[PDB]
Design a binder for this molecule. Structure first.
Ligand SMILES: *[C@@H]1O[C@H](CO[C@H]2O[C@@H](C)[C@@H](O)[C@@H](O)[C@@H]2O)[C@@H](O[C@@H]2O[C@H](CO)[C@@H](O[C@@H]3O[C@H](CO[C@H]4O[C@H](CO)[C@@H](O)[C@H](O)[C@@H]4O[C@@H]4O[C@H](CO)[C@@H](O[C@@H]5O[C@H](CO)[C@H](O)[C@H](O)[C@H]5O)[C@H](O)[C@H]4NC(C)=O)[C@@H](O)[C@H](O[C@H]4O[C@H](CO)[C@@H](O)[C@H](O)[C@@H]4O)[C@@H]3O)[C@H](O)[C@H]2NC(C)=O)[C@H](O)[C@H]1NC(C)=O
Ligand SMILES: *[C@@H]1O[C@H](CO[C@H]2O[C@@H](C)[C@@H](O)[C@@H](O)[C@@H]2O)[C@@H](O[C@@H]2O[C@H](CO)[C@@H](O[C@@H]3O[C@H](CO[C@H]4O[C@H](CO)[C@@H](O)[C@H](O)[C@@H]4O[C@@H]4O[C@H](CO)[C@@H](O[C@@H]5O[C@H](CO)[C@H](O)[C@H](O)[C@H]5O)[C@H](O)[C@H]4NC(C)=O)[C@@H](O)[C@H](O[C@H]4O[C@H](CO)[C@@H](O)[C@H](O)[C@@H]4O)[C@@H]3O)[C@H](O)[C@H]2NC(C)=O)[C@H](O)[C@H]1NC(C)=O
Lengths: 207, 171, 207, 171
C-alpha cells in the first residue's frame, strides 16, 4: 500500500515576506496498476482548493511518487494553523490523513552572541569564528554568515539542542584564513527567527 | 525609525527557449519601530528593442515617474523611466514589527502572460516553457507606505535578444 | 522472526583503563514458544568463548529480549578489531550475523579552545561558558566540566558535526551565575579522546 | 617530566549480605614525556579485627613496607603498613604517551576469593553475593616503574563489621 509523508515549509520561506512557503504532501509506493491519487486538503478543518499536483515521477523500483503542494500564508503558518492532507487510492483500505503545523509553545526571542577565536588557535592556518544563538523557541531558524555584504559559505551549524529551560540553542562556526582575521575584517552572523524584530538580527565580530 | 528594505538579486538571467526557471530575488524588511505600514512588491517589465545598444534605467525617475523628463525619456526607445501597466504586484497590509511581511500578505495581481506565474507564496517570477516573448528588462520595486524603499533590475532574455542594462544615476 | 542489534562499548569505557568496555548483542522479538537462542562470537574471524548471557527479560508485548555481552580489551577495540555476533534460533531459517567495530579512518587529535561569554551577555542572570572541541576523528568522545575539582553538571553538548575536512567538531555550553564568573573562579573543560596524550586534556577558563 | 597519576574514589562502601556491587575507583595517568614506563594497579586487603576501634594506615610505610617499623606496626592488629599477598594486580608494560595505559595492558592476577572478580577490562573489583567474609580495609595502589604514584583506601564492609580507617601521616 502507498505511504504518505507531510512536510512543513522551509524556515526562510516563512520568515521572509519576499518568499513563498508551502506544505508538501508526498505519496510514495504508488503502484502501476492504480496510480490515480485523490487529495483533500484542510486548514483547521476547513477544506481548501488551491493545491497543485507536481508532475508524476517514476522511481524505478516498481512504484511512482505522487506529490501535492499547498501554498500557505506566512501569517497562517506562524499563527499555528493546522494543515491536513488526506490521500485516497484504490490500493488503500481507507483514506490516509497526516497533519502538520508549527511547533506549539510560546515563541521566545533568540539571544545572539558572537565569540572570537581562541588566542591559542592563532598558531593554525585558519581560525574559528563562533556565533552562539540561544534561548529560542521554536527550533525553526536560519543562520548564515557574511562580510562586506558578501556571503561567507565556509561554515557549519550544529542542529538545535534542547536546553534545560525548554528553549533551544545552537552554535555556528565560520572558518576563515588567519590572515583575514588579523587584518581587521568585519564578519557578521545573520539569524532569522519569528521572535526577532522583523524576523532578523545581525551580530558583527572583528579583532 | 521607519522600515529598512534590502534587496539582492543577480542582474541577468540568460535562458534558452523551452526552459523553465524562476527569478531568485531576496528581500528582507526590518521594522525599526511599532508603526503600522503597508508594502507593495512590484514587478515592471520593459521592452528592449533590437536596435538598442543598451537599456538605460533612469534611477531618479523611479521615484517620480510622472515628471516630464521621466514620462518622455530622452533615450526614448531604450529607457526605463516610467510605466503604466505593472506586470505583477503582491500587496501587504497592516504590517508591523510584530505582524511581519509574510503574515501581513493581503492581495496579489499578475497580468495575463503566457507561461508567466507567481511561484506560490513568493515574490519571485516563474517562467514555464520560456520563449523570446519573455525577453526584456525587469525591475522589482518595493514600496513601503507608497514610497520606494528598495529596487533592483534583472535582464531576463535569450542570448540573441540580450542588451546590457545601465543605471543612469546622479553624481 | 527475531531481530538483532549489535552495540559498541561506551567511549569512556574504551578510553579509561580503570573501566571495562563491552560489546552488547541484543536480540528482540524472541518468541515465547522458542526462546532458546544460541550465540557465536568472533573477533577478526577467530571464535571466542568468554561471553555471558544477561538474564532473560519479558517485554510484555508477546516477546522476550535476549542479550549477550562480550568483554573487550581496550587495545583490541582501539586497534580496529572486528566483533561479529551470530544469532541462531529455531524460528530463524538461517543464522543472523551483525558486525561492528571502531570507525575506520586515521585518528586525529581534537583541538580544545575555551571561549568566555560575550560582553553583551554580562547583563543577564546567567552567563554561558563555551568549549570548542574541533579537528577530531573518530567522533567517539566524552566532554565534561568542573570547578575546584568538583563536577559542574549544568551543561549541554551538541552532537558531533562533520566538518569540511573530514574531521568532527562540537560545542559544549556550561551555564553559570554571573557572580561566579565575575569573582575570578576557575572552570574547566575536560575532554577524553583516544588521540589525546593519555586520552585526556583539560582547558581552563577564567579572568 | 615523568608520569602523573591521580586517583579518585569514595572512602567507604557499606553493603548488606547477598548484594552484588563493585568499586568505583577512577584513575587517570598523564605521561609528560615520551619515556617508556611500566604500571601496576595493585589491590591490597587488610583484616579488620572486631576488637579494633579503628584501622590505622601508615602512609609513609606504603613506600617502604620492608622497614622494621612497618613490618611490625605498633598498632599491630589494627594497622595497614605492610603486606605479603596482593589481592589482585593488573600490570601494564611498554606504556608511553603514545601507547597509553589501556593499550599497554599486559597481565592480570587475582587471588582465589569466593565471589570476587575483575569486572572485565577494569581496575575495579566486583563482589557477587557479598558476605561478611568480604569485609575489610582495601587499598588500591598505583605503581609506575615500581614506585607508588597514587593510592587510595576503601573500607568495604557490612555495618556491624565497619570500623573507621584513619590515615596516619607525617607533619
Ligand atoms: C521505492 O523508491 C522510493 C524512492 O526512493 C528513491 O531513493 C532511494 C530510496 C533509492 O533506494 C530508490 O528506492 C529511489 O530512487 C522509496 O521512497 C522512500 O520511502 C521511504 C520509506 O517509505 C521514505 O522514508 C521517509 O523519509 C522521510 C524523510 O523524507 C525526506 O528526506 C529524504 C532523505 O533525505 C528524502 O529522500 C525525501 O524526499 C524527503 O525530503 C524532503 O522532501 C520534502 C518534500 O519535498 C522537502 O520539503 C519541501 O522542500 C521544498 C523544496 O523546494 C520546499 O522548500 C517546501 O517548502 C518543503 O516543504 C524537504 O526539504 C526534503 N528534506 C530533505 C532532507 O531532503 C522521513 O520523515 C520518514 O521517517 C519518519 O516516519 C517513519 C514512519 O512513520 C519513521 O520510521 C521515522 O522515525 C520518522 O518518524 C521516512 O524515513 C523516503 O522519504 C522515500 N524517498 C523518497 C525520495 O520519497 C520507496 O520506499 C521505495 N519502495 C520500495 C518498495 O522499494
Ligand atoms: C516489543 O517490545 C520491545 C521493547 O519495546 C519497549 O521498549 C521501548 C524502547 C519501546 O520500544 C516501546 O515500544 C516499548 O516500551 C521492542 O524492542 C525494540 O525494537 C526496535 C525495533 O526492532 C529496536 O529498534 C532499534 O533501536 C536501535 C537503538 O536501540 C538503542 O536505543 C534505544 C533508545 O534510543 C533503546 O531503547 C535500546 O535499548 C538501545 O539502547 C542501547 O542499548 C545498548 C545495549 O543495552 C547500550 O549499549 C551498551 O550499554 C551497556 C550499559 O547498559 C554498556 O555500556 C555496553 O558497553 C554498551 O554496549 C546503549 O547504551 C543503549 N543506547 C541508547 C541510546 O539507549 C537502533 O539503532 C535501530 O536502528 C537501526 O535499525 C533500524 C531498523 O530496525 C533502522 O531504521 C535504523 O536506521 C538503524 O539502521 C532500531 O531502531 C529497539 O532497540 C528495541 N528496544 C529495546 C528496548 O530492545 C520490540 O520491537 C517490540 N516488538 C513488537 C513486535 O512489538
Amino acid at each position: 500500500g502507498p505511504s504518505v509523508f507531510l512536510f512543513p515549509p522551509k524556515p526562510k520561506d516563512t520568515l521572509m515576506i519576499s518568499r513563498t512557503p508551502e506544505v508538501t504532501c508526498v505519496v510514495v509506493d504508488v503502484s502501476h496498476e492504480d496510480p490515480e491519487v485523490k487529495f483533500n486538503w484542510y486548514v483547521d478543518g476547513v477544506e481548501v482548493h488551491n493545491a497543485k499536483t507536481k508532475p508524476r515521477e517514476e522511481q524505478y523500483n516498481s512504484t511512482y511518487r505522487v506529490v501535492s503542494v499547498l501554498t500557505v500564508l506566512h501569517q497562517d503558518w506562524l499563527n499555528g494553523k493546522e494543515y491536513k492532507c488526506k490521500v485516497s487510492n484504490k490500493a488503500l483500505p481507507a483514506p490516509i490523513e497526516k497533519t502538520i503545523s508549527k511547533a506549539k509553545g510560546q515563541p521566545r526571542e533568540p539571544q545572539v552572541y558572537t565569540l572570537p577565536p581562541s588566542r591559542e588557535e592563532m598558531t593554525k592556518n585558519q581560525v574559528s569564528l563562533t556565533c552562539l544563538v540561544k534561548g529560542f523557541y521554536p527550533s525553526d531558524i536560519a543562520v548564515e554568515w557574511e562580510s562586506n555584504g558578501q556571503p561567507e559559505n565556509n561554515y557549519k551549524t550544529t542542529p538545535p539542542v534542547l536546553d534545560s529551560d525548554g528553549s533551544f540553542f545552537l552554535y555556528s562556526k565560520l572558518t576563515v584564513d588567519k590572515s583575514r582575521w588579523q587584518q581587521g575584517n568585519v564578519f557578521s552572523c545573520s539569524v532569522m527567527h519569528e521572535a526577532l524584530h522583523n524576523h532578523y538580527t545581525q551580530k558583527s565580530l572583528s579583532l | 525609525r521607519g522600515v529598512t528594505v534590502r534587496m539582492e538579486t543577480p542582474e541577468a538571467i540568460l535562458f534558452s527557449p523551452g526552459e523553465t526557471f524562476s527569478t531568485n530575488v531576496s528581500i528582507h524588511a526590518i521594522a525599526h519601530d511599532d508603526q503600522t505600514y503597508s508594502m507593495d512588491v512590484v514587478w515592471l517589465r520593459f521592452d528592449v528593442p533590437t536596435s538598442c545598444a543598451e537599456m538605460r534605467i533612469y534611477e531618479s525617475c523611479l521615484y517620480h515617474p510622472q515628471l516630464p523628463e521621466c514620462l518622455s525619456p530622452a533615450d526614448a526607445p531604450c529607457a526605463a523611466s516610467t510605466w503604466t501597466s505593472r506586470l505583477a504586484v503582491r500587496s501587504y497590509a497592516g504590517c508591523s514589527r510584530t505582524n511581519p511581511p509574510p503574515r501581513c500578505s493581503a492581495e496579489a495581481h499578475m497580468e495575463p502572460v503566457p507561461g508567466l506565474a507567481w511561484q506560490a507564496a513568493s515574490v519571485n517570477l516563474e517562467f514555464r516553457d520560456a520563449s523570446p516573448q519573455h525577453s526584456g528588462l525587469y525591475l522589482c520595486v518595493v514600496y513601503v507606505n507608497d514610497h520606494i524603499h528598495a529596487w533592483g533590475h534583472i535582464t531576463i532574455s535569450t542570448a540573441a535578444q540580450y542588451r546590457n542594462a545601465v543605471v543612469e544615476q546622479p553624481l
